[PDB]
Amino acid sequence: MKQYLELMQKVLDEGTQKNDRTGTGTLSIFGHQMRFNLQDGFPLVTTKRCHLRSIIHELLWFLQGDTNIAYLHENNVTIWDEWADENGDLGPVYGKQWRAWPTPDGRHIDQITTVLNQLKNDPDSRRIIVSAWNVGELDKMALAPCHAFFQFYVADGKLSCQLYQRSCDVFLGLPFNIASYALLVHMMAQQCDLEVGDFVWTGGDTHLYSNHMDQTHLQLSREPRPLPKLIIKRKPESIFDYRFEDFEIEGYDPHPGIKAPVAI
């Protein structure tokens, strides 16, 4: 899509050359922001084929708060395999913080229920926030949260959300990340009887890996196509009762997929 391709081009034109944790070099920029009016269509990249299966399962998995990959495995979703230990545990990553942020006094805070309580009883609140950046638990996590913190906003009967992504691989991760949060907004909006507003993506270290340059130029040579439409075939009794089959993408006609390998 337009916003995405503009960012890719920006990284190419303005990015500075610098490596990553003892590894592949990158071109990076710091601080960028894109806005997607969800009423204009579901923001699933069209300049390359993207699959939503893993994205949907991962989101349902996050919402359940259990950080063991068992559920992902039961559905043959392997995106977290390289980070899980022999027992399938990842430590207190995303889901754990979203649903059970541990306090110093022994309590566990359900931020998702909190946000829903706020959207229902105090929609104009300026602190409808969910943070996964639990400083005291970073060392126990298989990896530090990338999509670290998001905030909701309501105006004119529409639900908007802004995500702060501290680090972003523009080619591989960004499309996935945008789709994931767009889905969450639709789900939250359905549960609150609200229309969807804007999804605002804000990035920190936004980069392109040196070995994805040809892939980037190829995708930039393609014209974005009309965005698909997200359909939720059922209204669950709560944000925790959604099922994989409840989602359907309509009118998605992307260009062919583009493979982008990674170093180890």
Ligand X SMILES: O=C1OC(c2ccc(O)c(Br)c2)(c2ccc(O)c(Br)c2)c2cccc3c(Cl)ccc1c23
HEC profile of 49-89: CCCCHHHHHHHHHHHHCCCECHHHHHCCCCCCHHHCCCCCE
Closest CA to 137 of 129, 128, 148, 127: 148
Q: Does 126 bind ligand UMP (CB under 6 A)?
A: yes
Which amino acid appears at position 116 of this protein? L
Quick one: 161 or 190, whose CB is closer to ligand UMP?
161
Contacts for 50 with CB less than 8 Å, ≥ 6 apart: 44, 175, 176, 179, 254, 257
Alpha-carbon distance of 85 to 83, in angstroms, equals: 7
Quick one: 68 or 118, whose CB is closer to ligand UMP?
118
Give the position of tokens 């270290």: 205
Q: Does 252 bind ligand Oc1ccccc1Br (CB under 6 A)?
A: yes
Element (H, E) at 169: strand 158-169
Instruction: Say if residue 209 carries a ligand binding annotation.
Output: yes
Which of 21, 126, 233, 259 forms a contact with ligand X (CB under 6 A)? 259
Closest CA to 111 of 33, 190, 193, 188: 188
Closest CA to 117 of 81, 206, 109, 65: 109
Q: How far is the CB of 52 from ligand Oc1ccccc1Br (least distance, A)?
A: 4
Quick one: 53 or 108, whose CB is closer to ligand Oc1ccccc1Br?
53
**Please, are residues 207 and 169 in contact by the beta-carbon 8 Å criterion?**
yes
Alpha-carbon distance of 113 to 185, in angstroms, equals: 14
What does 52 interact with, of ligand X, ligand Oc1ccccc1Br, ligand UMP, none (CB < 5 to 8 A by kind)? ligand Oc1ccccc1Br
Q: How far is the CB of 98 from its own copies (least distance, A)?
A: 10
What does 233 interact with, of ligand UMP, ligand X, ligand Oc1ccccc1Br, none (CB < 5 to 8 A by kind)? none
Strands 158-169 and 195-209: parallel
What does 21 interact with, of ligand UMP, ligand X, ligand Oc1ccccc1Br, none (CB < 5 to 8 A by kind)? ligand UMP
Which of 177, 190, 215, 216 forms a contact with ligand UMP (CB under 6 A)? 177
Of the listed 50, 146, 161, 192, which one is catalytic? 146
Q: Is 161 a catalytic residue?
A: no
Q: How far is the CB of 235 from ligand UMP (least distance, A)?
A: 28
Q: Does 258 bind ligand X (CB under 6 A)?
A: no
**Please, are residues 147 and 168 in contact by the beta-carbon 8 Å criterion?**
no
Residues near its own copies, by CB under 8 A: 16, 18-21, 28, 30-33, 35, 101-107, 109, 111, 124-127, 129, 131, 133-137, 144, 148-149, 151, 153, 155-156, 160, 162, 164, 166-167, 197-198, 200, 202, 204-205
Active site residues: 146
Binding positions? 21, 51, 126-127, 166-169, 177, 207-209, 263
Q: Name the site residues for ligand Oc1ccccc1Br (rule: CB under 6 A).
A: 51-53, 249, 252
